[PDB]
Every structure is written in C-alpha cells, then in structure tokens.
DNA sequence: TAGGGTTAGGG
C-alpha cells in the first residue's frame, strides 16, 4: 500500500461551519477516505479552519488535486499535499510556490536531464542553470518554474529526485528575502 | 489555511 503521508491532503481555508461530516460528504466523491477531520481549538472545540482527508490511494488523491476549485459548505478552500510534522519545521515549508530550487547537479548538466525528470509532475515554465556572474562557470544547481503550485508540491513531499543520473536535492524556491529572514 | 494527549531511553 502507499504511506499515509502521501495519502492525505490539508485542506485550508474551510468555513468555520465545515464538520468532520460536511468535509466528508464533499471530499468522498473522489475516492474512498480512510479519515477526515477537521482541525479544532482544544479547549473552545472551535474549528481552527482547516481540516485533513485521507484517501486509500495516491491515485483517488491525485483525482482530488484535479478537481480544483473545490467549495466546500459554500466557501472556496485550499486543498494541499500535506507537509509531514517534520517537514513542517522547515521555514516557508507551508508556502504556496510554483517555483523549485534544485541542489547538488553535476556540472554537465543540461535543461533536457531536468525535463526529462520533472516534466512527469507538471508544465514547465521556465527552467534556468545557474552561473557565476563573471567566471561562467556553473555553480551547481537550478530554477524550475512550474504552472501549477501542486507541482512543486508533489516533487517536495518526495525524498529522492534523479537528474542527470544522480539524485539532487529539492526544495521550495525562497525569494532573497526570505532566505535572509530564514537564517 | 499546518495535525488529532504524535518525537530521546536506559543501559
């Protein structure tokens, strides 16, 4: 079977009416769900407005994905891979990016080793290897731009990722900003 | 819109 963390989808945004029940009820029609709840404050019971799904398939989950815009109980939510306890830890872990940064390619490698490897999770926008400003010379790593936030996400939630016949690391895209703010 | 009494012992 598939890991419970790549079963399940966070689903923000949901109305402060959105029960275990009404989450189901909507939620269900993509695929059979092995839990659902919504997310409440331990001592008011209020809802915190966000929930979690799980279904018995990666696929059923990725039919879920397909199906945005969802409204659930009359308001428009966001439905996220969810980012494991652990991963949650990482700064901006949580943000809604279209871009990635990829870690730790050989210096031989060319825009068709990350299309080959990650066009399968999504449109590419724009792919760009980075350079030292001066020298030309190649500094390791890369840009992918995708159309769909999900995209990114379906990569990041994943450990290992092949480009150029070697894994590389990957993770979220931070603006220069936030890697300051980061540190 | 980031988790439900769900994260370092005791040899």
Same mark, same amino acid.
């Given at each position: 079977?598939?890991? =419970?963390?790549?079963? @399940?989808?966070? +689903? ?8 275990? =029940? ?5 939620? *269900? ?10 997310? #409440?404050?331990?001592?008011? /019971?209020?809802? #915190? ?6 279904? %018995?398939?990666?696929? $059923? ?9 969802? @409204?659930?109980?009359? #308001? ?6 969810? !980012? ?15 871009? +990635?940064?990829?870690?730790? &390619?050989?210096?031989?490698? $060319? ?12 449109? &590419? *926008?724009?792919?760009? &290897?980075?350079?030292? #400003? ?7 790593? %890369? ?8 995209? !990114?996400? /379906? +990569?990041? +939630? ?10 590389? $690391?990957?993770?979220? %895209?931070?603006? @220069?900003? *936030?890697?300051?703010? %980061?540190?």
């Amino acid at each position: 079977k598939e890991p =419970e963390q790549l079963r @399940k989808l966070f +689903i923000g945004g949901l109305s402060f009416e959105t029960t275990d =029940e009404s989450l189901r009820s909507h939620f *269900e029609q993509w695929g059979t769900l092995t839990d659902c709840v919504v997310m #409440r404050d331990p001592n008011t /019971k209020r809802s #915190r407005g966000f929930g979690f799904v799980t279904y %018995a398939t990666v696929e $059923e989950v990725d039919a879920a994905m397909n199906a945005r815009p969802h @409204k659930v109980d009359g #308001r428009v939510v966001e439905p996220k891979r969810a !980012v494991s306890r652990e991963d949650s830890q990482r700064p901006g872990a949580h943000l809604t990016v279209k871009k +990635i940064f990829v870690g730790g &390619i050989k210096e031989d490698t $060319e825009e068709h080793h990350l299309r080959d490897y990650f066009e399968q999770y999504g449109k &590419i *926008e724009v792919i760009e &290897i980075m350079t030292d #400003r001066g020298s030309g010379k190649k500094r390791g790593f %890369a840009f992918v731009t995708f159309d769909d936030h999900d995209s !990114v996400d /379906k +990569i990041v +939630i994943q450990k290992y990722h092949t480009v150029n016949g070697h894994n590389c $690391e990957v993770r979220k %895209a931070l603006s @220069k900003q *936030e890697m300051a703010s %980061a540190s």
